[model samples]
Target: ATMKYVGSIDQGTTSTRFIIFDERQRPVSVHQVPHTQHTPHPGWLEHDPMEIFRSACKCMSVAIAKLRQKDASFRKIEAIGITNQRETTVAWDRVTKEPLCYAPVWNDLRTYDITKKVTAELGGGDSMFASKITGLPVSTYFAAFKMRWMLENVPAVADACRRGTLCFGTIDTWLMYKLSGGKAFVTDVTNASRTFLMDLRTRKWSPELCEKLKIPMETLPEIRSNSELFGYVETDECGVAAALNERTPIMGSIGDQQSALFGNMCFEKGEAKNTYGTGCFLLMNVGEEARFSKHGLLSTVGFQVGRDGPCYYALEGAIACAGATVEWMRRNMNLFSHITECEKLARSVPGTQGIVFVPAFSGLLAPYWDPSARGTIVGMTLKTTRAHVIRAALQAIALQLNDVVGSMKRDAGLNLSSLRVDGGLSKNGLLMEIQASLLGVDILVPSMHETTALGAALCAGLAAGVWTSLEEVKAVSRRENSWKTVSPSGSAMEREAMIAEWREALKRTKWAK
Candidate 1:
């Protein structure tokens, strides 16, 4: 059957989703399944690989079913794309294709000591050479240290690696391996950039960095361009498989944040978007130039669509925890029965009312890189109610973006007039308004919020010739509404005073063990 739409599987840190988008870059159907996060020990987070794969299969089937119900002709999905959480490390047995252990989640800090050792040997914990080589700081967040810890510590992993019967991958490579029935073991440059294993200049796995981290080269997957046909879906229980005879091309894929940047059409240098997921990821496109950041921001590939050519690069700043702060308030403090209630309560208050929350629950990432930092609530007293705290939490989310965007402005030497926002928390007007107020810029929201999925579909559409260029794609891009620009309404001194209070809160938070 001839295809008319492109389908994408967006496997995220907390949920597995399948989305179908037409040529207009709008989502026609979506299905998502929230999986479980396992915390066997403090600072350790894991997700069962089998469970994640199953969720992807179920979501794909459900989404396809929903699409067919909406329109019979929607069955013609030309190609499939995948965009997923990066740096969540996975290990699998080559012989059986079964995972050796649960994937270490991106927030897991179990590899902290390993990261410290690697950093110590490199020159110290804070070496520019590390960032210059890897394009990222030496932190527990990336995959290489996690892989090193697992391979050296886990008996099963060590044995498998010794025998050449093991394979290591980030989430994207793992999903592709499973989806293709092991016919393909590859990852794109965007995902590879997060692993600290790829050379920034060569855009290939770096043997020197691998050796320094004690990682075996034999277990790694081949690196490819973001938009190349990685492989075919040899066996898909997701209903769309039968229609395409299980041979449909899985063409374009990237890390989820990179996908969102592309989906938002931040195609040129200085253009950017911030996705408010469990954490806030702000990515600014720097085009073909791979400019390294002297600041605490990541320099990585935005995407690579063609072979033997220059790749688009970007500076990425991550917050580590954003929406997860709301989840914490719900579960830890019992602040509200539901997450939506926090939004409602936040809106009830005009503002945080002298309250400020620094959501360093995991740590402050990008522009600060403080892993020892913890969450803090300042200016709390008898006057502060749950509503005020909730509002502070929302403000904290926006403030984190301010730090990152400020760093981006300084590093890239570009002043952004507006920021395109999406993801779960972007639905909160109060939060978006706070974001705009703090940044003193307009916050643009798309009509369709599923930009991650739409991005994957857009890549596939471009690859399939369904869309000629990014301009053509943007012509059909829908703008739902935008928040009013919130330039510093107060005097420069007043703005500085507020920021000073925030910085003081951060200092106290960072010093809190």
Candidate 2:
């Protein structure tokens, strides 16, 4: 039977989207909705699990309805895929299947003290034994630390764990379970990799880690591959049974960045991509060996195409604030009315007026991992204005990215000769130019900017036989634009000096005791 179409659910930091694609990878229809962000403390981030589920269902219905209205013959969607925010942790009860508390978002730093204490306990001073096993440093930028915090702080979660009725998962596993109406409670290896609960070498939950972290192994999901029959769409709330009628297999799933990596067709070793979403995440294909990060980065699982295939590894660099900082300027600071206005605003000003805005809003993630690094804006004077701050914000993002690349090169000896870029922020030409100028590397933006959904659909298509081999998937990957900023003379020296000033300011931020 010939495949008709594929569907992908993209659960991101601020929003959820459902995109439908034809056999040829052309998008048929899409629907997206933003969710609310709850911040209780200074560096805290949370989300309502139920509200996210509602958005997921709403987006699916909206997209499917639009597709039906356009093409009458598009009745069958063979398989559905999911790609999600990697490290946001969700804890629920197996009995009622409702989240016990607000999901601790990936950028949340409430568990910083706990993580540092645990890391020191696991490994003596000045050394991290857990890093060798978990492929990550002790930081709140992971799901396991968040889960550990919930068990200790949230009374309901602690009770559930004691009663042996707790089910711990990331956004992916929670959505999958809800989509299947409690029939499934699992996560793909790509999502599992972010937990730091799973062993990097084995690509599975570690028995020793379970006891060490005080997490019950029974609560973790069964890790699956990116491409496989995960489950079937059984819900009828979004007119599921009323439409296609037959149950379609939910076949593919991966974390957002890895899905983007696959969607970018970075199959070969050393190929890399940077996704500028709520945070900026850089991941490079590293084939198989779980290389440890001497620099402040995480060695994560890139993808596992199938259960039988070898799990690809990736060295990941995370910037805790990127697009989210832009959002802050829009909503809180009122720097501009819309995000599109950022480029123009930045260009209006020559530079940051020597200002360096370290967007450590939730603390620095990679190459620093300082959870206590408070945001700071230094070198401001009477000449400083809102535009200067805005320009500095954009420059800060670029500088952060370059630092990440610098770290990656040191750790893996793999420089990003060229980087494929994606996500909502890739549309800004000024931003791209700044990125290229900062890194001194070619920045390629794929024709399809949002590759997370594409990656999900791609995995589903591969599993459902829409495309037989990876080469076929490769054939369709196309770049829409390319940029390489011409650095002015002495600009390199200027940049280095700027970084020196930034470091001085970073030191003053007091990154924990």
Candidate 3:
């Protein structure tokens, strides 16, 4: 009964999950539910806002029930943390608290025309004109572009905007508002950082940028720190309020990638973590000062512990495919019957045998910024087998991370001390070994892989006094969790030779335009 617990709502691009963690930072109970992926146009992706909220509610109820079955003394979660997909803009009426239109996901390309228009007309041919202030380029991936498109395209959204009844938020804000029963309208700094409307240094919405973008300031949510009392869970949707068994404060909220950074304990500058999920996001903590990117990376907030607390900035680089490429090989290409065979067959072959694969299926992001780049393979011979192609795919993911890290080193002016890795693909030992050799640094993989959820739980626990300080959190994690370290083993000549071939292969990937 004395053991404290925290809950994290991990709302991702395609699903929602609820995880309950004890004071020791171990997840005790978990439940997940998938939501529909709505694609109205060729390059568009949307999610039903109500479907996501209901999914979150169901997860909480199911996870709570599961926890009670295991432990008789377990009561209610002390606090709830929220971590979600960044830049998925949601619009709703403040009075009704209902979505006006389907949300445009972070990767949706419906904003492509608007992006180019902004760059040419507003930026005078420079996509990075506002990069100094927003720490971002004018791209379709940003929330502001999506919001602008919604206001221009959706009549209901524009009507609400004109009536001063519209509300704009990222996933975090939307979930918190609905969970609080419309009482709290807030967003965390990490989520706000992706909106392209926030100032990187001040950590506040930039009126200048918002005005230029024509997104109404009145429609946005209040930006708060990652860990603070945002609100209490007040909704009875799916019996979640009753399932909680008590009034729980919502104390933590952040973007999914930033939550993984916090969960991996990348507290110091030069410390970094890479999440190999649906996509690959590599973030490096750059201390208190924000470092703008000159080599196609992003400057964003890693995490903020308390209200007005020191905000740690990060240099972020993203690859459009990591585990997605692996799945494509298994399902689309039918290269293997099962996932286990992927690594087994790849390991059977000593190396790629002078072949390189560029898994740029959804275009290349970070360092390259080539929207026209398509997936390409080079040096395939008659002797090439599924094993070589699989190994080459793994190499492609590592090579992309290597390039992103190289850019971060130059932009941040700091060498990476080490890397902490997580997500489903991190379990692949062959992939870890390849990554370690390419980066020339040790890669620490956590045995407990629910890092993204742990991050939000840690944020809530810290604010609620379940865990007091950053050092205490680290001590608990170190004592409770185990890690495996992979060290560099490849020769320098071998590394250089592979990178040379990778560069040559990239030149042939520009076929989409």
Candidate 4:
């Protein structure tokens, strides 16, 4: 063949998308499908595993068909990659190859009580008791807590476990298993790190944590690297197998957050990326040696290129609201009717005018770790308008990120070299500029925004010989992609004043009991 392409299955929180990338690292064709969100009670979220699997298969066939129509040179995809929402856990039976119950989403709060019990009983009232080994706090956002909840609540899962026919896995493992027609049951290191069952240093299942957490080690999947042969696509659902025209191997697998990190090309120490989605996640590469966090930020395996490759570690921090705050101002507060107007109004105002908006609607996460913190605004006056409030909200997001970066720098003992950003809110020029000014670093924004999908595709391409090495992948990206760089524009005096107000405003946010 003259040229070859790689395919990536982006299994996200609310939707599933398939993107095919040429050897030049450009996504030539794509298709997306949405699945149902089953929320049975308040603060609980679930997804039907069968529905997601079916949606993924349908996306594959449709995308392949569209590509063939557009490019006559296309013969077959060299390999397939998978990237999915991390920590959303699924349990199934190895014999039936079916999910035992509805999968709990990463943000689902159903595991709250169990999380408390684990922290109190097992962790001796300290969530970070096992943080040295797992690099993760004992929070409900992890998969181990969800698995424990299922074992205690779901009878079928318990029965399957006792019968030694149970299998528990993250979205990546589940998709690989289903796509391989139940031939493969594996997860990559990036996904495995979020389970709280894998040892961060060794990159293997920690038998001690598994036994202590009461989750049998047999329920877990075999762990692999980000770039390797995970399995093959053997399923015929939606004619995906036949659409490939030949056998296709699944090579790349990574969690969604780490996938963004890889896609941004933060390949060296001190480089980082911040994904501005419903929330903001900032992950900084801390080199080959795993750096544990003294702050609340998560220590995680960034990515491993191939089997037995040197693993890059990261320090991760999260802000509960980024674009979500912009959404609230538009939909809930009626500050603006459109997203464009939200940014426009913020730019219309010169600054917050002594006001600081702490959009901690769901409390503060990381560094602060204040569950009692509520959404609070300080220094409002009769002269204030919606524009100032909107600007203050945007400033709040940047300020929180500043604190996260501050913590990362301290914990990792490294200065940030640069930051690559993606996601919905990254489009806001004012927000990016604000973030750059606060962090005092260059903000690089890629013109091709399908970075998450590209990470998985790059992994698969590397493993399948479509790309020979990471250097080649980076070189191709530079030749094929354009970028917009936002440099720091604000003065040091102005930054200090904003931080002063932010510090003062945070003191009043503890309204919840």
Q: What tens digits encode model 3's per-residue C-alpha lDDT throughout 171-219? A: 9999999998999999999999999999988999999998999998999
State the TM-score for model 2: 0.84
Q: What residue runs in model 2 are displaced by over 4 Å at the alpha carbon?
A: 1-3, 33-51, 95-102, 109-113, 125-127, 153-159, 324-341, 345-365, 368-393, 479-513
**Pairs of residues clashing in candidate 3:** none
Evaluate model 3: give its lDDT: 0.94
Give the range of the ten consecutive residues with the poorest summed lDDT in model 1.
Answer: 480-489
Clashing pairs in 1: none
Deviation in angstroms for 283 in model 4?
1.1
Q: What are the C-alpha RMSDs, in order, of all predicted structures?
A: 3.4, 3.9, 1.7, 1.2
Candidate 2 RMSD computed on C-alpha atoms after optimal superposition onto the true structure: 3.9
Clashes of 1: 0
User: Which prediction has the highest TM-score against the true structure?
Assistant: 4
lDDT of 2: 0.82
Candidate-wise lDDT, in order = 0.81, 0.82, 0.94, 0.93
| Candidate number with the higher TM-score (3 or 4) | 4
Which portions of model 4 miss their true places by more than 4 Å? none
